[PDB]
A and B are shown apart, each in its own frame.
With several copies, the nearest count.
Chain A
Amino acid sequence: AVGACVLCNSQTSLRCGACIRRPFLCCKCCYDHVISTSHKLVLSVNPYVCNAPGCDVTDVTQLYLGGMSYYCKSHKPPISFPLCANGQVFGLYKNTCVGSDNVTDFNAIATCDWTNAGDYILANTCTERLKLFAAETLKATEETFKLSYGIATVREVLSDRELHLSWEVGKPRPPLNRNYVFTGYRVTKNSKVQIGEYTFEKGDYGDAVVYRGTTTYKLNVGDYFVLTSHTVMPLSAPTLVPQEHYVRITGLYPTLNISDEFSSNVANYQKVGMQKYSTLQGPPGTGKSHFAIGLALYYPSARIVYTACSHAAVDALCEKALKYLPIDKCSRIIPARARVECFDKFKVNSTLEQYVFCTVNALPETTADIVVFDEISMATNYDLSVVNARLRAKHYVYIGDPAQLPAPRTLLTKGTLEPEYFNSVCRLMKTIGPDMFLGTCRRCPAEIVDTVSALVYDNKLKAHKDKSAQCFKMFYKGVITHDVSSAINRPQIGVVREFLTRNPAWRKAVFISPYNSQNAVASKILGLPTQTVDSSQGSEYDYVIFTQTTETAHSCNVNRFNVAITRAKVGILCIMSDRDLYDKLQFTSL
């Protein structure tokens, strides 16, 4: 199967068998790669090996072709010649293979293991074709790394709403949330097969799990759980189509009597209909989700495709649209596997509908008028290319805040990925600035809102409110136990329950923690409704209690702190450790 060279697009049929992706390479580029890097295994229509009766030589420069086969120096016939000579590698279209000096970065892209931060940043500044390859190989590295995971099974039948966990000894465990699902396997005697996938959350005490059931087929101990690895398919479309602005709105016909609710964004809406792709950013809780429905109502007779990486965001957008937009002309696209508790309120899974909601993974190849991508911060370049490929629309609308949290990026373990290099869209937004912004806020007290605006943003937020005087920030040690995959602070909750008797206000509060272990545990001794930091970002509250467990870079992340403290409205009791964080914000000392 012939293809195109990655760094010169020239016709070729050569692949670097040593590279994980075996990308296509032309004669000149392939020679530059093999001579430069340590990769000395290259795949043409046939593998390049010594085809002797008994011999094993994989190096290409040491291989010579004889008869109709390939051999080393010790098995060649009296006739020549080297495969790797004349500055070129022997192959197809030998006389149209143009070389490029870009091999210098290609070597780093291929040879790196993504452990350090430098790879990501350099994996994002490369050209389009190299960008796609870097994304593909990074995702392949992620999947391969996931192949090394801790497998478990149910101890036995304990409760219908909660199972128990029995992991293998000598392997780690993954984080427990909605993003991470697991597959049960049925190797009993008797035909290893699947019955359903489960999502797990830490149990009450010791060992236990409060789970989510996908299929009603209940399992005995004959099955065991794995972290549902899979493969990666290749990509062709660019991360971002070229920016081509418009003069007057084309294909998008404005509405009549749009609404009195969001008439302030009309200009933005037409500007949303202006650029081929538009980038809007708004701080936590400012109606960008609201802006999406506003835009949809601005163009009523246009087919709109809502897209988001995760189920939570797309489901929230779906609910908001049901609330405002007409409910009949809706089509939520559901994965066939249904590994999540899906959203079934519309006439579900009608791909030929006007307002079509889908997640990045389950998008079917179709066409639209305008597509709105949401939460690009967690989105990766792979997602961007996938949406570019499967979907074609007259307009694109990327809405998200790089000041939010990043994608998981589990393989990254050393170095901190700064916002500018989260992905192509984040780099664009940090380079030229978002095409749109709305800086009004209505939730946080005066001192907190002013200080938060002062931390990272350019002093453009103010609260149409007066401080409720129930916001605090203390210095409690909260000795750490952390005897589980995530940190826990129980004695901090003890210090809190020393309070909460003199402050009857927040007796219906929501507990939040930067570690899901404390999130699980805090709901056990006391029945406080729980909502991890990730599960925030889309809802507003008046009584929230956030607790800090450790002191590190993950604890001083201004993005995490911002999204943590901006969710309360009138009262929040805080457990805080670091003086550095303590000197940026004003709170009562108690």
Chain B
Amino acid sequence: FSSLPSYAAFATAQEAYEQAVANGDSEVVLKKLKKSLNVAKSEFDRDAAMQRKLEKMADQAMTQMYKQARSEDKRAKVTSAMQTMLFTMLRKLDNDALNNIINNARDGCVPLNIIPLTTAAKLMVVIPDYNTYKNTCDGTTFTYASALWEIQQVVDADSKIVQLSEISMDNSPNLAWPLIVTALRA
């Protein structure tokens, strides 16, 4: 605003008008300077108003260009995270058994529901009470999915280790059911 020469033009016109007024300039001269002051003031506000649009306009650009810049910066991070997740999950695959089962497929396509059931190397069984425990996985080894598994760990709801001997009918109330038992494929 003040930077533009319109401010200086208005200031000098106003100064001349005041000097003429205090100097007792004639009415014809007085009107001339006042009219000159008006047009000088007219330009001063005319280019002043456009500034409001300008700095206003710039702010949205910054906010917009902040936002667009902000988004892409976040886009790369999430893309890298997703790629890392995919590759880490890949490295967990049992390539041998997976290949053996998938090659047996006539069309090379198999239902997903059997991918773990025929290749997963670790079995988790969640048991609500002692009767189901005894029915399903009594002993240090058991059978499921037409395969043999051996118990390697047993934990309670609190993620506290539990010894197999502790899982007894009389000791059942003292255990924080349900039990998560983890076994391996043999």
Contacts and interface: CB of A to CB of B under 8 A. Distances in A.
Give yes or no for direct A-B contact (beta carbon below 8 Å): yes
Interface of A: 1-2, 13, 44-46, 65, 68, 79-81, 90-92
B64 A1 contact: no
A46 B73 CA distance: 14
A79 B72 contact: no
Interface in B37-80: 50, 53-54, 57, 60-62, 64-66, 68-69, 72-73, 76
Nearest to B53: A79
Nearest to A65: B61
Given A65-B61, A68-B61, A79-B57, A45 B50 contact: no
A45 B76 contact: no
A499 to B, nearest CB: 63
Contacts of A1: 69, 72-73, 76
Contacts of A13: 65, 69
B150 to A, nearest CB: 31
Contacts, number: 33
B60 A2 contact: no
A44 B65 CA distance: 9
9 contacts: A1-B76, A44-B65, A45-B69, A45-B72, A65-B61, A79-B50, A80-B50, A92-B65, A92-B69
Nearest to A78: B50
B54 A81 contact: yes
A13 B60 CA distance: 17
Given A68-B60, A81-B54, A2 B73 contact: yes
* 7 nearest CB pairs, A to B: A45-B68, A45-B69, A1-B72, A45-B65, A79-B53, A13-B69, A2-B69
A351 to B, nearest CB: 15
Identify the interface centre among B61, B65, B68, B72: most chain A CB within 10 Å of its CB.
B65
Nearest to A81: B54
B4 to A, nearest CB: 12
Contacts of A45: 65, 68-69, 72
B66 A92 contact: yes
Identify the interface centre among B57, B60, B61, B76: most chain A CB within 10 Å of its CB.
B57
Contact of A79 (B54, B64, B69, B76): B54
B67 to A, nearest CB: 10
Contacts of A81: 54
A68 B64 contact: yes
Nearest to B72: A1
Contacts of B65: 13, 44-46, 91-92
Contacts of B64: 68
A587 B65 CA distance: 75
Nearest to B75: A1
Contacts of A65: 57, 61
B79 to A, nearest CB: 12
A92 B66 CA distance: 8
B53 A46 contact: no
A336 to B, nearest CB: 14
Interface in B92-151: none
A44 B53 CA distance: 23
Contacts of B61: 65, 68, 90
A494 B69 CA distance: 71
A515 to B, nearest CB: 47
A45 B50 CA distance: 26
Contacts of A90: 61
A65 B62 CA distance: 13
Nearest to B47: A80
A65 B61 CA distance: 10
B47 to A, nearest CB: 10
Contacts of B57: 65, 79
Contacts of A2: 69, 73
Identify the interface centre among A44, A45, A80: most chain B CB within 10 Å of its CB.
A45
Contacts of A46: 65, 68
Contacts of B60: 68
A516 to B, nearest CB: 42
A81 B73 CA distance: 28
A2 B66 CA distance: 10
Contacts of A92: 62, 65-66, 69
A44 B66 CA distance: 11
A46 B50 CA distance: 26
Nearest to B69: A45
Given A45-B72, A68-B64, A79-B54, 8 more contacts: A2-B69, A45-B65, A46-B65, A80-B54, A90-B61, A91-B65, A92-B62, A92-B65
B113 to A, nearest CB: 34
A352 to B, nearest CB: 15
Contacts of B69: 1-2, 13, 45, 92
Contacts of A91: 65
A72 B73 CA distance: 30
A98 B26 CA distance: 57
A71 to B, nearest CB: 14
A419 to B, nearest CB: 42
Nearest to A1: B72
Contacts of B50: 79-80
Interface string B4-30: 000000000000000000000000000
A44 B64 CA distance: 13
Nearest to B70: A2
A438 B66 CA distance: 59
A580 B57 CA distance: 74
A224 to B, nearest CB: 32
A65 B64 CA distance: 14
A152 to B, nearest CB: 37
A2 B69 CA distance: 7
Nearest to B68: A45
Nearest to B60: A68
Contacts of B76: 1
